[PDB]
Amino acid sequence: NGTSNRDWWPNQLDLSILHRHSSLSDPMGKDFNYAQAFEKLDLAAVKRDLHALMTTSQDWWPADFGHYGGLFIRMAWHSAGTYRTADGRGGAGEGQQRFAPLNSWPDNANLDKARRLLFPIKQKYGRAISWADLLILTGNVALESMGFKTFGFAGGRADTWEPEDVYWGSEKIWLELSGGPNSRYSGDRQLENPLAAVQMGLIYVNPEGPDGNPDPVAAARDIRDTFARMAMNDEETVALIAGGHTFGKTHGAGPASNVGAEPEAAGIEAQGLGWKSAYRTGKGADAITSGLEVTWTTTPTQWSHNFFENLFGYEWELTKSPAGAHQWVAKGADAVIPDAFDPSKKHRPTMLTTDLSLRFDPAYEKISRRFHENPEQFADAFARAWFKLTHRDMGPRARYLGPEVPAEVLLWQDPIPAVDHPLIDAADAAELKAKVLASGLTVSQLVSTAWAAASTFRGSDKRGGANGARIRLAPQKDWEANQPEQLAAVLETLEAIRTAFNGAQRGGKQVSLADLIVLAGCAGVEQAAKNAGHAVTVPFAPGRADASQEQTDVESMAVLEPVADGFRNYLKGKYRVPAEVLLVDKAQLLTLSAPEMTVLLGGLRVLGANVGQSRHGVFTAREQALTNDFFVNLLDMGTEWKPTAADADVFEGRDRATGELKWTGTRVDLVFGSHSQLRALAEVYGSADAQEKFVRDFVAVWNKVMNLDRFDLA
Amino acid sequence: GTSNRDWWPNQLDLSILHRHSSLSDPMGKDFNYAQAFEKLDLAAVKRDLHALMTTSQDWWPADFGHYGGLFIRMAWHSAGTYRTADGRGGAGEGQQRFAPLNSWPDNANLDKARRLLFPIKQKYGRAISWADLLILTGNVALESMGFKTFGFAGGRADTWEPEDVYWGSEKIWLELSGGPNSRYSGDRQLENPLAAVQMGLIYVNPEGPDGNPDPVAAARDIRDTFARMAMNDEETVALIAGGHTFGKTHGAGPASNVGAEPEAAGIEAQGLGWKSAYRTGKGADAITSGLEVTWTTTPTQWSHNFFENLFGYEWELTKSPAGAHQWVAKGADAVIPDAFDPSKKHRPTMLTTDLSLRFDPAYEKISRRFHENPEQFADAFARAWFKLTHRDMGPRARYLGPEVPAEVLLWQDPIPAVDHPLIDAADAAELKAKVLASGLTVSQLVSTAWAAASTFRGSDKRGGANGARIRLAPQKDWEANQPEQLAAVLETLEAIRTAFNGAQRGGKQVSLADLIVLAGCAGVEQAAKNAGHAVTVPFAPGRADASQEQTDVESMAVLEPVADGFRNYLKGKYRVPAEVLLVDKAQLLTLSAPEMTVLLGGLRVLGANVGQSRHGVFTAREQALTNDFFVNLLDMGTEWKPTAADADVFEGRDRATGELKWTGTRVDLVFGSHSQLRALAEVYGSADAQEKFVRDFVAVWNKVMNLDRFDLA
Ligand code: HEM
Ligand code: HEM
Ligand SMILES: NNC(=O)c1ccncc1
Ligand SMILES: [Cl-]
Ligand SMILES: [Cl-]
Ligand code: NA
Numbered sequence A: 001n002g003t004s005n006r007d008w009w010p011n012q013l014d015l016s017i018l019h020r021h022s023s024l025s026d027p028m029g030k031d032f033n034y035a036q037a038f039e040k041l042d043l044a045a046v047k048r049d050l051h052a053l054m055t056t057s058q059d060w061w062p063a064d065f066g067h068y069g070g071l072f073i074r075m076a077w078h079s080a081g082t083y084r085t086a087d088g089r090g091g092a093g094e095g096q097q098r099f100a101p102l103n104s105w106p107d108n109a110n111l112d113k114a115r116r117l118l119f120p121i122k123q124k125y126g127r128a129i130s131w132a133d134l135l136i137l138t139g140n141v142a143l144e145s146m147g148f149k150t151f152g153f154a155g156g157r158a159d160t161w162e163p164e165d166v167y168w169g170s171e172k173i174w175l176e177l178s179g180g181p182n183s184r185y186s187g188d189r190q191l192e193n194p195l196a197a198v199q200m201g202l203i204y205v206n207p208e209g210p211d212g213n214p215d216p217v218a219a220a221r222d223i224r225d226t227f228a229r230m231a232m233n234d235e236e237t238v239a240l241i242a243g244g245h246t247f248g249k250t251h252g253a254g255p256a257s258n259v260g261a262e263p264e265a266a267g268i269e270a271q272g273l274g275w276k277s278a279y280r281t282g283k284g285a286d287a288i289t290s291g292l293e294v295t296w297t298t299t300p301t302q303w304s305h306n307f308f309e310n311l312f313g314y315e316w317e318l319t320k321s322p323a324g325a326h327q328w329v330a331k332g333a334d335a336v337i338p339d340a341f342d343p344s345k346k347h348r349p350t351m352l353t354t355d356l357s358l359r360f361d362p363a364y365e366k367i368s369r370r371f372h373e374n375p376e377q378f379a380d381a382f383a384r385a386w387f388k389l390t391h392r393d394m395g396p397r398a399r400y401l402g403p404e405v406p407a408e409v410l411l412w413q414d415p416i417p418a419v420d421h422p423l424i425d426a427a428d429a430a431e432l433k434a435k436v437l438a439s440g441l442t443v444s445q446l447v448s449t450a451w452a453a454a455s456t457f458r459g460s461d462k463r464g465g466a467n468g469a470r471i472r473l474a475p476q477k478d479w480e481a482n483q484p485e486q487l488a489a490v491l492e493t494l495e496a497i498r499t500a501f502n503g504a505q506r507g508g509k510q511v512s513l514a515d516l517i518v519l520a521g522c523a524g525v526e527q528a529a530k531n532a533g534h535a536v537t538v539p540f541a542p543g544r545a546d547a548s549q550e551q552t553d554v555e556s557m558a559v560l561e562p563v564a565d566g567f568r569n570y571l572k573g574k575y576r577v578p579a580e581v582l583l584v585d586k587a588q589l590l591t592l593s594a595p596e597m598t599v600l601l602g603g604l605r606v607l608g609a610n611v612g613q614s615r616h617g618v619f620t621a622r623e624q625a626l627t628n629d630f631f632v633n634l635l636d637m638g639t640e641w642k643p644t645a646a647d648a649d650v651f652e653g654r655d656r657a658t659g660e661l662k663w664t665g666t667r668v669d670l671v672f673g674s675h676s677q678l679r680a681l682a683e684v685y686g687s688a689d690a691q692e693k694f695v696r697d698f699v700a701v702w703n704k705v706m707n708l709d710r711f712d713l714a
Numbered sequence B: 001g002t003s004n005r006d007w008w009p010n011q012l013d014l015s016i017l018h019r020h021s022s023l024s025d026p027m028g029k030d031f032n033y034a035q036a037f038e039k040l041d042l043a044a045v046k047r048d049l050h051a052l053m054t055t056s057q058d059w060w061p062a063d064f065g066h067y068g069g070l071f072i073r074m075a076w077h078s079a080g081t082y083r084t085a086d087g088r089g090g091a092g093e094g095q096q097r098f099a100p101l102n103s104w105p106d107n108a109n110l111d112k113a114r115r116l117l118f119p120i121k122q123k124y125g126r127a128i129s130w131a132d133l134l135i136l137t138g139n140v141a142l143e144s145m146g147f148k149t150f151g152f153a154g155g156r157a158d159t160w161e162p163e164d165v166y167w168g169s170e171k172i173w174l175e176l177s178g179g180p181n182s183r184y185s186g187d188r189q190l191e192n193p194l195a196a197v198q199m200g201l202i203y204v205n206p207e208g209p210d211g212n213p214d215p216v217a218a219a220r221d222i223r224d225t226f227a228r229m230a231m232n233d234e235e236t237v238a239l240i241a242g243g244h245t246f247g248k249t250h251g252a253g254p255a256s257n258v259g260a261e262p263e264a265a266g267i268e269a270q271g272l273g274w275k276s277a278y279r280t281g282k283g284a285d286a287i288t289s290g291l292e293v294t295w296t297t298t299p300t301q302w303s304h305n306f307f308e309n310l311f312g313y314e315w316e317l318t319k320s321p322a323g324a325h326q327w328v329a330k331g332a333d334a335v336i337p338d339a340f341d342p343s344k345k346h347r348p349t350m351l352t353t354d355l356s357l358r359f360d361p362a363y364e365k366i367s368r369r370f371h372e373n374p375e376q377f378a379d380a381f382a383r384a385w386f387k388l389t390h391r392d393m394g395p396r397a398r399y400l401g402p403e404v405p406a407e408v409l410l411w412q413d414p415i416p417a418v419d420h421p422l423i424d425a426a427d428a429a430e431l432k433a434k435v436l437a438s439g440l441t442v443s444q445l446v447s448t449a450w451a452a453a454s455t456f457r458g459s460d461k462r463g464g465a466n467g468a469r470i471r472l473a474p475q476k477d478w479e480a481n482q483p484e485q486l487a488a489v490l491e492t493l494e495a496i497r498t499a500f501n502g503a504q505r506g507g508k509q510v511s512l513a514d515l516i517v518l519a520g521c522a523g524v525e526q527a528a529k530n531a532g533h534a535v536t537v538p539f540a541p542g543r544a545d546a547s548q549e550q551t552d553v554e555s556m557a558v559l560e561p562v563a564d565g566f567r568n569y570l571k572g573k574y575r576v577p578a579e580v581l582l583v584d585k586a587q588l589l590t591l592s593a594p595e596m597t598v599l600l601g602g603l604r605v606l607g608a609n610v611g612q613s614r615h616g617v618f619t620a621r622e623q624a625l626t627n628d629f630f631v632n633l634l635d636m637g638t639e640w641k642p643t644a645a646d647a648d649v650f651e652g653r654d655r656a657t658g659e660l661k662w663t664g665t666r667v668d669l670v671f672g673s674h675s676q677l678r679a680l681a682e683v684y685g686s687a688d689a690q691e692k693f694v695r696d697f698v699a700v701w702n703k704v705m706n707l708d709r710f711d712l713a
């Protein structure tokens, strides 16, 4: 009820997304290092306790079949299942299921119970196992307990301490069907990027069918699209759904109107739980979670091949659960499926609409039949897919901790070869920077190429960055933002330098192209500082390696293309989201604060890093010199700015007294003179005492970006 | 995009505790603004500001060729958002340059005033904060026009994001009272903590209450709002008449000409707003308030013409060119200069709220005294201007520069100078042992030191343990302080003090303020020992004891804790939920969410609750410093339900037997409910956390004890 700045100005940009996750909200000390904690955990001990928990039923949420394994597999699947390849946001890697909004999503109903069941284990091991690792490890132990051998497990997901700022959609009603005022669909059922779910508060798709219509073929279209938006192909998708639905059951014993407030809405006495139900005992046999009432197999607590036997072995009739939801029952079947609580009851086989998709979509049916005929193929596929699902956002294999990490390198990990030769030392770095500057490559070309290589990193899923030298490979070499023709010329010169240096060495010392691109960028920044009269050495850390084309999945790389990069004043097309919002989004992915974003952008503009050598925001008469000119000129009140008649998103800056044109700029350039918080930062850097501070802060942020993916040095 | 606040609009907001991280600050971690300021050539800055006064810019031409009135309004408004209820607002953080205050309707065209000052800010850089520059500029404006100010102190460090302040619940700018989110109830009772009559005003409406042009009624709103800003009748009259000696209002055409406020304006406006389509949009055509008044015959020179005109004319109700109600002198000649045309003159004019100074009977007495004795007027105005502009700066030890007034003012809650050697580490150890041998308990010691130190609030830097004001009126008799228990503790400590000071040589002595804090430190050490942990709690001497004569009792009243969740105390029944009031108190204390959480769970097991209430005392070893609050709060074997007698008190029963185990309030149980607070509770309730909990508790306790220690900056 107190009115806030977001109430008064709801379309203004939000910078607090860049300053979340401060050391203020973190209870652990500054020096806490979770990897080091984890590495001394007795992982086998934790696994024993998790095995014991499986069948330790608690009366406040009694275990179906006497075994929590299905509930825990669903919990871990949902932890990972929020992931979107568009921006890398979501996934299991930050344990965000325990914070709002995900703790209270309708699709996460009763997973508050699942997490609560794990607190005694959490408490016993304390800081040595994060919630984020614990949720995945529990799902793995559930599978092992029920007879499925997993492909492996890595720890190293540090806990976080507040909610992430993620765009989950614009709907203001949970579960709203398509076509409303804030619809996430347009056109021929085109889901808006970056979303990867069909309704607000769902993980991927609606189990009754698209917008509730129980058509398995149409549902399969939604399955395919959302799963692809979560990095899964058809084979992985079938394996995951059929694999998962080998276990456990759904819950829909009575009408959904019996279920009360989600956790964030519940009373303080609920002590963090939600969805309290007035139906009968509210739990156990009477539980209501989705509103469906399906049990897939004849042994829901044991790995089996019964899913596909049932799917293909019966014909299916449409029916309704006790809550009124659409679901399917096997025609003419006997009552062969066990009841979760009463040994004297058995049930006919049942399926969701979206399970039927696996049989009635023609591409899925071929895979399903293969898995039915070849169950060893199904098991192997499901094990690989479960590992990928649960590790997709963990980043390079260098982050993976503990004794159960799979040795097999997987293409989806964007793998980087091991380095098996001496690295360049400081004298060698100095020799190579001189050679780069004697080649004729310009500051603009050197800065632009390193920026292009390093700025693909995003902290949301720890993909991208300059390691691997993938800028030389498809598809990065051909991205428009990367200036393919310019890039090719710089890479040819750098590869000739490299060849010359490597051919002159002894021992096995060599420099990778990945390291040379970054070092060359560093030489450009040093040259730019010299051009401005400043003596600056830029730090450089060797050790990057070059990945091959065959180690580079081109379709998976596509999502890393910068379609909006304000740091290079680039926008690939016209978007509904304003460019300055896209700039803050990119800064968040790069892990930048607002001051770092500000310094970086103003430096890049005067170094010539704009795509196409655009003059928009180039507020200097000494381009390729590292100065604070961007800020001093942007803040000059002798210039008046107006949008152009040709293009409302480009602005002309004229002398206020004469009308003479002095500059042009975009929304990304001018926001720094408009937003009250951004302008306060620009004033610091545009003050007469600030040139050396600007240069030193620029070098620090430049080095930060160059090192974002260097978990080999963590 | 839909946010958590959208889905759950009533859920508690912890992000207010985590502002001002080193993430959002452009200056290095090691920047110290006092060190930069102390080397500023303040005289040179003032010479540049003096020259700016009469250097008109054509994008916002100077009225009368002089920006001094604009800048005095700018500085008044920077200071004028201050509220004594919570200390929030004021000029001390330079928040006029951030949302929402940069876009309040009462701050219209002060974007232009701040813009005029950027060349000077640019020249001097980090050596002068925006916060200090806005105030300095108002002083130089006054001095340039012939008024002697009382002084100036630097030291307001800049901030880098908006403050989270409750300004009201209205959703429309300037909404008149009586709407669905009215800030008035009863017989025109303004809701605490608010200190303005309408959302987006500084104090009152210049046309009269809700627009009704009755000076007598307006005076009641003036008196109420200004008292809520720490000003009495003399100060109020001096300030309004002082201010309105200078400059003019702006209302040349209809207000529908004036476009979006700065936070709403297009990107091309480059941080300015209120662009006007009326004629030239500026200068002679300017529209700010919509009133068109010029008070004196010399708007660029200090005078006593405000009161000569107020009392020398009778007044007629009239309307400005924008349609606002205002007053014009009956029968008068055209003696007031025009701001741009030297061939035009105007009749004297006044606002409804100016006329309050004559038609309220108490104001009229003061106004007539100042009219007859303009030297009294000048002195009252200079003192009130200093107070206004420094009220949120904190102890005088924060005051920087060569123009600091030597006079000590009662409103500063002054602390006497220390003129003797301080106790050393071995002395402190001796005194801690003497305190523990006296028979004072852990609960008594912790509760007394908490009581003394936790009056601090970082909003205006008032309060804290320095001064030993806990022994004086009114603190000694506040209910939350447990007056009879407190008196017993204080008598025991004063006997220890007397014994130790009587045994010394060389003039060494310990103040009661330091011994209160040290005794609390001994209690926390003892509690740790009771748990099996040997720890030393840090302690820094150098507090002094203030006298009763040096303590304004009425000004102290706003520091009374009516809600202190750290002592499970709520003085009465409020509309705002107790958990929200806990977060508000944590923000005032400058605590993060982790610090709040540790501190509360420790206080509960040390016996710090008012009245020895058992609510939240989730331990069987009270007075031992353990993490038992968290381990017991998180025990899923306990089921919690509100009591039938009181919905805000909960019983914790064994889930299997029904046996009563504990009771708690909303402040206790929020740590088990709120998803971010429960995550913190889980860290401190884990089996590996004993050592960490003790360490973190001692660190936040020491932070609280030192909040007012600017003598150690
Ligand atoms: C098209 C994709 C999917 C849909 C629409 C879907 C739908 C559902 C629904 C409606 C439930 C019932 C929740 C309740 O009422 O308790 C559920 C349960 C479950 N799902 Fe899925 N699912 C999908 C994919 C997955 C995947 C990929 C996994 C894991 C690999 C998985 C594993 C499980 C398990 C184990 C259960 C049983 C939970 C219990 O025993 O408590 N599902 N699924
Ligand atoms: C009851 C309290 C007060 C009310 C209702 C009030 C009202 C106003 C209004 C409506 C304006 C015209 C804004 C514009 O259209 O440009 C203004 C101007 C001004 N006020 Fe006040 N005021 C109050 C107190 C003060 C105080 C305490 C001071 C300072 C000590 C101050 C100093 C000024 C000055 C110098 C101007 C002239 C600005 C210029 O020349 O641009 N006022 N006042
Ligand atoms: N929403 N979460 C992210 O965007 C992110 C998380 C961690 N580092 C960079 C970005
Ligand atoms: Cl996320
Ligand atoms: Cl404030
Ligand atoms: Na992610």
Ligand code: NA
Pocket (backbone or CB within 6 Å): B087, B088, B089, B090, B092, B392, B458, B459, B460
């Ligand atoms: Na304040």
